[PDB]
Design brief:
The PDB classes it as ligase. 2 copies of one chain form a homodimer. Chain A is of the alpha+beta class. Among the domains of chain A are: about 195-280, Dna Ligase, domain 1 (2-Layer Sandwich); about 470-700, 3-Layer(aba) Sandwich (UDP-N-acetylmuramoyl-L-alanine:D-glutamate ligase), CATH 3.40.1190.10. In chain A, a hairpin with an 8-residue loop joins strand 9 and strand 10. In chain A, helix 3 packs across helix 4, helix 4 (about 100-115) packs antiparallel against helix 5 and helix 21 packs antiparallel against helix 22. The interface between A and B is large, with 46 and 49 residues.
Chain lengths: ~700, ~850
């Protein structure tokens, strides 16, 4: 199972983005014949997801499915696996879904390596070292997949059908298209101010700002000119904390309840750094309060790794019980780490008057860690529903004060259920771009759709202008139809992005020259911050090599089928091209516009999922068109009559006469059937796109193809 | 001069401008100047030349004030006050002068004193003396404390547009509006500027890619990882190429020169790239609002066919653009080796430029001081380049930013003249577009402030209202309540508290303007009420420059003085509010001293408030159409009636206002009338005023946020500030209403130290209301003995019928509280007064009972 050649479909070519692999094997027949039952059973151990089909053993399906499952293992959305017979005997092309190119490609190569290796098994009956391939693949994928704050935002975007694109890799994503584009970088949005981020970083400034708004901020903290610290301790109120200002030899004296403890603490703190500082002791658990749109959307308590007593089991036993938790480990699927009886745990138990062999009573929580982390063993606990309203308001107020779109309050308290007014809780810091990891799928309690909240902030349903309208013309070598349409739209007041297959244009200007294949040309336009609407002429070769550069179009048209022109290969007559161009019809959502005077084009109507089928014909009595018209369906018809030789639009069973053919300068008083078609399609599309007849008439009149 | 005691005013007292300096070699107290006379100011006539305007201005108070003022002028301050006033000491006067910032104004004072001392040293040392040494010290200080140029320009724009601003930090981060409307600037960045756009601008490689894909003229470039490949990328780019925050390898057509570059160009470490090189001048294209507002060419130091080079360099250095650098900003260059190498490249000799119209670069980077200059090109830039810049900035997503762009000729389109974008500047310098050396200046500061606060909705400020009375905070609370019902978020001070909306956020001794700051910069507030205190007015003045609406309710009652201490003096102290009220000033017309304030206020409207009397002056004002609030009798007893434009507007019957108990009712009528008056002045509707007054809660049924009542431990604990006797009374009433039926009413009193014998008043409020009493006035503050104060309290209580048996003395605040908390049982009520509120709250919360 070697690889000869690959291509990647960025967009639809069939239905959805997918790589193609041309593979060769030759113990080819032996490979299949010798599988028996033993191979699927071997794969059932390493990749159990494919246990569902041990029957279609054709190697094409095995490879496609294995590559697909590798991606699923790495967290890909359930996709599709296919096989197709190649040009040579005992040769195959395989296709499977992908998310990221590098990963899809690797999954293919690894699926091959995994299968090739079995050929060296000889007279075996067991899987040998298959997990090594798996590990390698995941190590690679995990460095390339999107980080969880961003992944959850994207998932929300997918649920809400907001398009998104990675830019600058990492966690930075463009969301929305054209002039409506917003950006997200993990938990920050493009709305978030630079100043608010600076402030969140500057803990001292942050404390001052929040303190002045009456927020529970442990600002405090100053022994001015190393004056008597005791006086401060007495003014603050015991218990107190005496620490050096400079957090480098930073021994810290805590829980001081006597002047003598303070005097000692001062002398100890004195030599470290430029200053010594004194603040009240604040204890409790570490909470994160997440605010997204001047509204708290989630809150969670960070709990250091611990055990809870029952009066039955020793701490050793309780830890053993905790580590039965399958979520604990350092494997790919392990979110939490194991709870370990290390030195810190022992120091803490001594501090509590316990040992490893002690048995805590029912309901006592014993922290085995000095601070919460996930990597040290620890948990996130949802407390969103039980936040005292004062604390909710506090959080909202604090984030507002800083000026973040999205941020979280690092808030310490003994009980979040009680107001901060009554419990000396405190804001420790403000987190700009906070992790969403602990609020979505927290360790205990219900999750919160925080990703949703952010995307809803960016693109509220009101004027949810997530996208410019995309149209595509299935041309037959002429950019004229596309130019007529973009021209109408420009005159109509749109900034239109369009592709010409050898160029990308914005408004009237050309920005990009080169082989403007589907993928690149669409992206050039869709990401352009000035664009209202896109016209996107697509190269036949683009569809063949990489597929469409976009996932679907609102309006799309097929004008013709063939000519004596550059081939793509395969049939290159009325066939092949029909299927190449059909793909546009297949992804048109609102209105698909078909040349009804062309049999191969007309048939495409059977496959399009478009809400409306508009027929274009030069025959006022085309049988089929008149029927569709009678029923209220759309058509563009060239007609003679008492109003002259005119193009009339039909919709809802009514004639909507548009203009004279002699008033369109691309014709020579209508003896230019190719431009008549171009105009009828451009007009059809413009109508579907909701332009007025005056705008369409004006556009076609004011059209100058030079 | 030995300076004894000073304070600085930030707001109104005597014009809101000045620090106040009380100063005094004792043997030369009068004699220094009497000996010297005025013709010694001859030095000062040169260093601080405005002083030359009066050769006989010998009063030393005026001399010091003027010198301190001029020192700030030298440091860049505009004009202001230089004023002298007679001191408390014989033959002494206090020194007052305008200031820009506190630290600098204070130094100007001290430095002025030292400079005048140096007018004579030893037997005599009057002329040709180092007064500039003191000047240098002063300016160096100022130069490190004042604003940077990005901020100075933006502030000036704010001044022109009457947009208030505040420093948020010690650098260039400035708040540029008031609460609710407030925006921020950090030099040339705004609070609007997105964090991601800044990150992208910084990421020069992403920036290049991002702009390139939009068809913008960027160079083709490739990244060198460390020095990998020695020479590589240039072979995919072309021979004309070049190779991390660097501020200190060109024309690498030689592959060996690129090998060097890969392994050489790391003064800032491994952040090295290979890019297509273009040549031309450095232009900065400044975009503010998706619109280019300014553009300028940075000009390398250069030679402009008559003179030799020696002559030309001299001609340039002798150009009266500058005396010295820094002080006059500008500098010019001397010839150096690099300059010579440059002139060689044009075919010139070390000493000669025979042609006219052939300019020679002498410098490479157009450095500020060791380089060259900047010229306006805003009016000549080809439209395509203008559009390019606007598109580039928008593409990155900065609201405000600049394009670092090269071209041979800025007047021709980039399409034809193959220039290119080098860098996108987030937080670009503004100064090179302002007062450029050649060409018109551009008001870019304006453009930014206009962007933030367009005139169409130029909500620069919340409305500021101020009451100057001591009426138990009630008037202010009534007004804030009206406004809240009307839909405002109100910010108000209570002198020992700050409230936002209905809630106490800050409780503590508020140092006058500090409370104003807390409110004015509060992000939620739409209108401010700001109750003030006589203490603030005398100590640091008001917290703000003017108010829209303001009121004086009374002058004096049964309390201690401050500074005449009758009706006079206080009138001058409070009048200052009237003096700065712009729209409507509300005066109690039943008090002569408040009434007279009408003569000083610049307010557009004067509203008069009276009780029942058909007052003669007010009735005239009514018929003449001025505003008034008059309590009147009527069919149902008594009513409040508003007058405006001669129209009678009955507002409400007083028995409908719930805050009417005992005689408090009479005081609350005054409170209500003023609150209604102010609400009217502020443009509230009558429905809103009536609704507010008839819904106002003066009983604290619902705690106003931090009213510090703690219901845990199985008993109620009320904590308040032991100072304001009215506040004390209020808590007693509250206790009276709660009337806990389980156990006992236990109270503990700690009136402040510097309070004469006011302790009597407190005893009057609490005596007979509690089952047991503790006193703890030792709060550690003044010398009133360790127990003088509790002894007075104990007696004052016994004098009102408290059994001596029921009085415990616990000197210390901490023990007094512990005592009570131990003493307490389930369903007791404990009322504790204190100085240290924070500490007491902590003690309460941590108490463990048995």
């Amino acid at each position: 199972m070697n690889i000869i050649s690959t291509s990647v479909f960025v967009g639809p070519n069939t239905f959805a983005r997918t790589p193609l692999i041309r593979l060769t094997v030759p113990h080819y027949a032996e490979k299949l014949n010798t599988l028996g039952s033993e191979v699927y059973q071997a794969l059932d151990q390493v990749v159990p997801g494919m246990s569902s089909d041990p029957v279609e053993q054709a190697p094409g399906m095995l490879i496609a499915r294995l590559a697909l499952k590798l991606q699923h293992l790495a967290g890909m959305e359930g996709g599709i696996a296919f096989t197709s017979t190649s040009q040579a005997d005992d040769e195959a092309e395989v296709l499977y879904s992908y998310e990221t190119e590098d990963i899809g490609l690797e999954a293919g190569e690894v699926a091959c390596d995994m299968l090739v290796a079995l050929a060296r098994a000889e007279a075996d009956v067991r899987a040998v070292d298959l997990s090594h391939h798996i590990a390698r693949y995941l190590r690679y994928a995990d460095k390339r997949t999107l980080g969880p704050s961003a992944m959850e935002l994207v998932k929300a975007a997918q649920e809400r059908d907001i398009p998104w694109y990675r830019m600058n890799d990492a966690s930075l994503i463009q969301v929305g298209q054209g002039k409506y584009q917003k950006r997200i970088e993990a938990a920050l949005t493009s709305k978030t101010s630079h100043i608010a981020v600076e402030i969140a970083a500057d803990k001292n400034m942050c404390n001052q700002l929040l303190g002045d708004l009456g927020l529970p901020v442990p600002k405090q903290r100053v022994v001015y000119d190393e004056d008597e610290a005791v006086s401060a301790a007495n003014r603050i109120g015991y218990p107190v904390v005496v620490k050096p200002l400079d957090g480098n030899g930073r021994g810290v004296s805590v829980s001081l309840t006597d002047e003598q403890a303070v005097k000692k603490a001062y002398g100890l703190a004195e030599p470290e750094g430029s200053a010594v500082i004194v603040e009240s002791m604040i204890r409790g658990d570490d909470h994160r309060l997440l605010v997204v749109n001047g509204e708290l959307v989630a809150a969670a308590r960070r709990v250091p790794g611990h055990v809870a007593g029952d009066g039955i089991h020793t701490i050793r036993e309780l830890i053993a019980l905790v580590n039965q938790d399958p979520r604990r480990g350092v494997g790919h699927e392990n979110v939490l780490t194991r709870l370990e009886l290390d030195e810190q745990a022992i120091r803490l138990l001594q501090s509590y008057g316990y040992t490893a062999d002690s048995i805590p009573p029912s309901g006592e929580e014993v922290y085995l860690r000095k601070t919460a982390n996930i990597s040290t063993g620890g948990t996130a606990v949802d407390v969103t529903d039980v936040i005292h309203p004062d604390n909710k308001l506090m959080a909202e107020r604090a984030i507002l004060a800083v000026g973040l779109d999205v941020g979280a309050v690092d808030f310490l308290t003994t009980d979040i259920t009680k107001s901060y007014r009554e419990t000396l809780g405190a804001i420790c810091e403000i987190n700009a771009g906070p992790g969403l990891r602990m609020h979505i799928s927290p360790s205990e309690g219900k999750p919160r759709d925080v990703g949703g909240k952010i995307m809803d902030m960016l693109f509220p349903a009101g004027s949810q202008c997530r996208v410019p309208i995309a149209a595509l013309t299935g041309t037959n070598g002429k950019t004229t139809c596309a130019r007529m349409l973009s021209h109408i739209l420009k005159m109509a007041g749109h900034v239109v992005g369009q592709t010409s297959t050898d160029a990308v244009l914005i408004d009237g200007n050309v920005t990009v020259k080169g082989d403007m294949t589907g993928p690149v040309s669409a992206k050039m336009v869709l990401r352009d911050p000035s664009v209202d609407i896109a016209v996107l002429e697509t190269a036949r070769g683009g569809i063949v090599r990489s597929g469409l550069g976009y996932m679907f179009c609102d309006v799309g048209a097929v004008l013709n089928v063939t000519s004596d022109h550059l081939g793509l290969g395969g049939v290159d007559t009325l066939d092949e091209l029909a299927k190449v161009k059909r793909v546009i019809a297949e992804v048109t959502r609102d209105t698909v516009v078909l040349n009804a005077d062309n049999e191969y084009t007309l048939k495409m109507a059977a496959h399009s999922p478009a809400k409306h089928i508009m027929y274009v014909t030069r025959n006022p009595e085309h049988t089929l068109v008149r029927e569709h018209i009678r029923l209220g369906k759309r058509a563009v018809v060239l007609e003679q009559g008492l109003n002259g030789e005119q193009i009339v639009i039909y919709d809802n069973g009514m004639q909507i006469p548009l203009t004279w053919t002699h008033l369109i300068p691309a014709t020579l008083e209508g003896k230019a059937l190719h431009n008549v078609e171009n105009a009828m399609f451009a007009a059809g599309m413009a109508y579907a796109l909701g332009k007025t007849l005056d705008q369409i008439r004006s556009g076609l009149r004011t059209f100058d193809n030079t």
